[PDB]
Amino acid sequence: ANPTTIANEVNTISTIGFSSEVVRLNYLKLQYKFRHLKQTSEKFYTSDSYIGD
């Protein structure tokens, strides 16, 4: 409501209310798989120009 003037004596004052809002956020996990060369087997593919097959 409108404000209350503080003049002489008064007991009833205007009020301030509060409110809340709740928001949900979802999180998802995903995975990918990839093939590669074994560390011990890299030495058998380490060519001079490049490493790999």
Binding site: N2, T5, A7, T12
Partner: protein, 153 residues
Amino acid sequence: ALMKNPQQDSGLLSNSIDFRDQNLIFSNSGGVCTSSKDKIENYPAKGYPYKRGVKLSFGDGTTELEVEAGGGDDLYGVCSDIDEFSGMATVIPITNNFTGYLTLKKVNPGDKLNFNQHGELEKVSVNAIALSKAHKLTEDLFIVLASVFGNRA
């Protein structure tokens, strides 16, 4: 003329020796007996409703509601004090009882009094019981000690 504190100055200092019959003045704001659990509300004043019953008055809608002198079925409370600078009248609601001096229409202890259209008490719905006889402060100003106990037929 009718304001709580006279605008005309006093020529002489008062003699503060006696202690009897020094409270039946128009400047006596509030009540003779007051509790700490009394509800009081300030409202914008339309006219001069001091020491009179007040009723709620509504405008076109641009401005807020106010209180004006009156009684009857429209009575909302009793004005016990006023601040002139802010034009704010302190009102005790009819739901709360009050004991003090109120304006009487221009009467013995035990008489039943109701508020008229001008917010003045008059002998008989019953709104208050007179606790004393009418005390004259001016040719038209008559006060009376009354006890207001709400609405009852």
